[PDB]
């Protein structure tokens, strides 16, 4: 008997937050009645107009969950505003329209790891911090690179800086010295990608840059 | 017969040039003859005065190679100016005296590392670098930390950052996602020092960061 209520009705969900272009958006309507009183089931003519970008017009997937609640889901393949009106027998409910961003989205798995960096904190022969440079700061890469870019960096002012690009698939161990003897902690290692997947022509080899 | 002169007889090593206050400095003496040419043998009597900072007198220990070469070995403990004179009878040898800058050296087992990054350029569905941000990107590193601190940054470019601190030997997984989805090769290992020294109290935990 309870009626649903354009007014006391809303919407929640990502899908009217922020959406992006290669991941379906998705949000979910609250019946709510006349009364204000959640609806307890379904059954209730919801509609979802969605414009998008040029003239685009997105056809919304409604999904009558049979608890008063209806689950959306739309496509919005084209980075823009996109006006997202849900309405009850033509009336707009709470909150309605939204206008809805979307940015072109990351397709994570075509995502590498490639560029990293580490900074180094010199100590003199007290245990005291250094405050300026001069030392013998040494880097060397060992592992099975494709390409291979590092620079060996005296900060001036008592750190140093390893800045470094890597492409291909194996271990790799980076020895990192002052003076001629290893840092706590070093050599650095690090898995990229696969181990298994390394192209069986390139071999592991040592790429060493020194600052002073 | 063939005599020493100190015109021509000449200095050449790092302990002239750039001199560490945690290492020995050594020099060579090149002992040449009155005509220009190197001395054959030994024995010929060169003097070494090193005045250090704040009225420091040094000892060099002076080492007679028996080949006209004489190996100058000196203790520099306190930064700042060293005057080198090597004569020969009262009369200083070609290019001495020389100043030579003593700073505080790293000493490199007590110096750590104190910062990583890595970044990872974001793809869209076209398979081109993104120009924007606005993707969740997580970054998660597992392991046993002594200490750790992490950030997951938006670089607002189409990039995005993992910049953290660790200290502890150990054996540490960190994943990547974006959108949800590991990025190729997350997630990857990492190895700082040596897991087998792990103190067996440090427990091997998460610590998680996301952007947007």
Do not use: W
Request: a negative charge; hydrophobic letters at 30%.
């Amino acid at each position: 008997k309870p009626a649903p209520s354009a007014e006391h009705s809303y919407a929640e969900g990502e899908g009217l937050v922020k959406v992006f272009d290669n991941a379906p958006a998705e949000f979910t309507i609250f019946a709510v009645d006349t009364k204000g009183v959640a609806r307890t089931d379904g059954g209730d003519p919801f509609e979802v107009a969605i414009n998008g970008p040029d003239g685009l017009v997105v056809d919304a997937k409604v999904t009558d969950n049979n608890d008063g609640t209806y689950g959306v889901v739309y496509d919005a393949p084209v980075e823009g505003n996109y006006n997202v009106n849900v309405t009850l027998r033509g009336n707009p409910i709470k909150n309605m329209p939204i206008d809805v961003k979307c940015i072109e989205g990351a397709n994570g798995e075509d995502s590498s790891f490639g560029s990293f960096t580490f900074t180094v904190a010199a100590k003199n022969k007290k245990g005291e911090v250094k405050t300026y440079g001069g030392d013998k700061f040494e880097v060397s890469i060992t592992g099975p690179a494709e390409e291979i870019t590092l620079d060996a960096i005296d900060n001036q002012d008592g750190t140093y800086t390893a800045a470094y690009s890597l492409v291909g698939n194996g271990r790799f161990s980076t020895g990192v010295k002052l003076n001629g003897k290893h840092i706590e902690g070093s050599p650095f290692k690090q898995v990229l990608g696969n181990p298994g997947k390394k192209n069986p022509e390139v071999k592991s080899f040592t790429t060493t840059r020194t600052a002073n």
